[PDB]
């Protein structure tokens, strides 16, 4: 967790972070991208 500083806009051990799940926003990237023949073109 050693301080970095600019590489990325947020420090991990940074001031006032906060792990806190909300039933409201179910974390998700993009897995189901459609590529099948008919659907991709």
């Amino acid at each position: 967790g050693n301080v970095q500083t600019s590489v990325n806009t947020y420090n991990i051990t940074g001031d006032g972070n906060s792990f806190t799940p909300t039933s409201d926003m179910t974390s998700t990237a993009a897995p189901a991208i459609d590529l099948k023949p008919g659907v991709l073109n």
Binding site: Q4, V7, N8, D15, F19, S23, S27, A30, I33, N41
Partner: protein, 604 residues
């Protein structure tokens, strides 16, 4: 527009022939229609996300803009000169072949790169369930971190780049809200790159989950149109192909199946014994057809399959009648002159072929398992073929014993090894079997309530019955799945049936005192268990004597209901019992909050 772009090779005037795919040193420019940019953008978007980890580890090469693989050509874009003429596009955005190659191998190369890191980020992320589905629940960050500082095994990648993975993470888990730099406090809202998608997956308390209930429907709709559940009780010849019978090899236990319970299996019900002989491999053996009726697999009405009669664990009393020992058990065909069930004595049996004997007598195949010597699991096995039995009116497959010397001891034995678990496997799907005949088409409606209790369980692997069972079974999972045929909600399924019972019980009341006005509260409830009994055991609808379900209306009715029922579910079908379902989710988040509370104390 769509397809490759074309341009007037003959210049100026572009007719349906003065065109030509504008190919060149880069390959052929294919048009990138609006939606197809959504994909390549959605793919690149998911890679750019990992920007902070690409720089950290000096891989990558800057953010991948989809505008680096395309171009701004203009011409007519279609699939063929003729139709491309009706799509004059100006300064459209096309991607040349050689480019369609990089945007491909780039998204592929980068995809590996991230696929790896993305795996480390995960073993650490999910390693503290950042996802609840009712209300909230925090877990003081210090602890959390100082905790994973432990658990995470020394070869992750979340220990070598904490806030190089954290920055990637913040965009995938709206659970981790980074503390704002100029107020040093969270944000209430969480802004992960998947802003919308993640909003529309949360288990919304009004109705289960839109992403769920939506698919469970489109999924069922697929099947309904696919297999051909529609037309499930159609009354007219249908090619077996229409039933896509696959992976279909059912096994039995004959020498038990009554002849009338399944046409493909006749029996030698004759007074005395019918000892015959046959020179097999020099040695002369005697097929018995002993004391009892000895049910044998008939050959006609037997779709050229792969019969594999297994004889194992089954008793082998060579201990008593010594006559039994010494005889090599073997599946043998038996061509009889007079039709079986009319074949009295030996002179009646034309010939007997040992289609597959077992090397080594009955005293090496044995194995003592507490007195009663059993059969060492072995599989005898013919490969019956429709035409190898051409002309031959009577012929039967019999997995008997082939005694090397009949005696008084084997006078009440009857060596039929058919008590074993035989497994026929139709090796030629195109041809089915029904009521004892081989056909190429079924008549669905005919097979409904036409089999008996066991004229079903005794069906022959890939025969109408087994096909008109594999079919109902799909339709049975579409209702079971999508429709709510398992609650007091008088659903579309049990509703289609109720309307039949009414229209039915209503005309049966027409003519005569009509002393009984139709019920309805009783009809709704009777049809509810009818539709329910179906989802339950799809098969039943084939057995003669099943209430409601077996009248010609139903099924033909049911399906076409369930049909339109799926094509309207809405999206919030999940509203069903979305109350207890909700209350159960809060139940979990309360217990998971309890977990975070320890992570929060133990590792302060």
């Amino acid at each position: 527009p769509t397809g490759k772009l074309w341009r007037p090779v003959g210049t100026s005037v572009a007719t349906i022939d003065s065109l030509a795919i504008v190919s060149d040193r880069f390959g052929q420019y294919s048009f990138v229609n609006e939606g197809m940019r959504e994909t390549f953008s959605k793919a690149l978007f998911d890679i750019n996300m990992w920007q902070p980890l690409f720089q950290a580890t000096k891989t990558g090469c800057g953010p991948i803009v989809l505008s680096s693989f395309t171009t701004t050509t203009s011409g007519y874009v279609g699939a063929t000169a003729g139709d491309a003429l009706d799509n004059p596009v100006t300064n459209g955005v096309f991607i040349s072949t050689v480019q369609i190659m990089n945007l491909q191998r780039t998204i592929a190369a980068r995809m590996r790169d991230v696929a790896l890191w993305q795996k480390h980020l995960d073993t650490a992320m999910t390693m503290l369930t950042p996802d609840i589905s009712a209300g909230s629940a925090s877990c003081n960050w210090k602890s959390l971190l100082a905790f994973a500082k432990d658990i995470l095994p020394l070869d992750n990648l979340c220990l070598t780049y904490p806030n190089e993975f954290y920055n990637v993470a913040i965009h995938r888990y709206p659970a981790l809200k980074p503390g704002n730099p100029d107020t040093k406090l969270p944000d209430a809202q969480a802004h992960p790159l998947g802003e919308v998608a993640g909003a529309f997956n949360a288990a919304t308390s009004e109705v289960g989950s839109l992403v769920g209930s939506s698919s469970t429907l489109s999924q069922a709709i697929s099947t309904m149109a696919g297999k051909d559940l529609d037309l499930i009780e159609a009354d007219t010849p249908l090619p077996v192909s229409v039933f896509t019978p696959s992976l279909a090899p059912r096994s039995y236990r004959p020498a038990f199946i009554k002849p009338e319970d399944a046409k493909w299996i006749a029996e030698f019900n004759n007074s005395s014994l019918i000892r015959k002989t046959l020179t097999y491999s020099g040695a002369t053996y005697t097929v018995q057809l002993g004391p009892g009726p000895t049910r044998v697999i008939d050959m006609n009405a037997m779709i050229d399959s792969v019969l594999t009669l297994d004889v194992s664990g089954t008793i082998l009393p060579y201990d008593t009648n010594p006559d039994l020992s010494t005889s090599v058990p073997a599946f043998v065909l038996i061509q009889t002159s007079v039709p079986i069930q009319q074949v009295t004595t030996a002179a009646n049996i034309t010939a007997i072929t040992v289609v597959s004997a077992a090397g080594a007598s009955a005293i090496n195949l044995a194995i003592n398992v507490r007195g009663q010597p059993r059969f060492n699991m072995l599989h005898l096995q013919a490969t019956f073929e429709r035409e190898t039995i051409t002309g031959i009116p009577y012929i039967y497959g019999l997995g008997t014993f082939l005694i090397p010397s009949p005696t008084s001891s084997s006078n009440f034995s009857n060596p039929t090894l058919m008590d074993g678990l035989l497994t026929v496997t139709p090796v030629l799907l195109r041809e089915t079997t029904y009521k004892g005949e081989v056909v190429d088409a079924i008549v669905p409606a005919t097979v409904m309530a036409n089999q008996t209790s066991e004229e079903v369980a005794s069906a022959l692997a890939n025969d109408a019955i087994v096909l008109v069972s594999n079919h109902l079974n799909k339709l049975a999972n579409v209702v079971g799945d999508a429709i709510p045929v398992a609650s007091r909600t008088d659903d579309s399924a049990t509703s289609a049936i109720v309307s039949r019972l009414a229209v039915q019980h209503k005309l049966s009341q027409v003519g005569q005192a009509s002393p009984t006005p139709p019920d309805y509260p009783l009809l709704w409830r009777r049809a509810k268990r009818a539709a329910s009994m179906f989802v339950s055991n799809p098969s039943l609808a084939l057995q003669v004597g099943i209430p409601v379900l077996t009248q010609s209306g139903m099924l033909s009715a049911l399906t076409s209901g369930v049909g339109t029922a799926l094509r309207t579910g809405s999206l919030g079908k999940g509203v069903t019992d979305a109350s207890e379902k909700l209350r159960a989710r809060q139940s979990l988040t309360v217990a998971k909050q309890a977990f975070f509370d320890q992570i929060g104390s133990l590792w302060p």
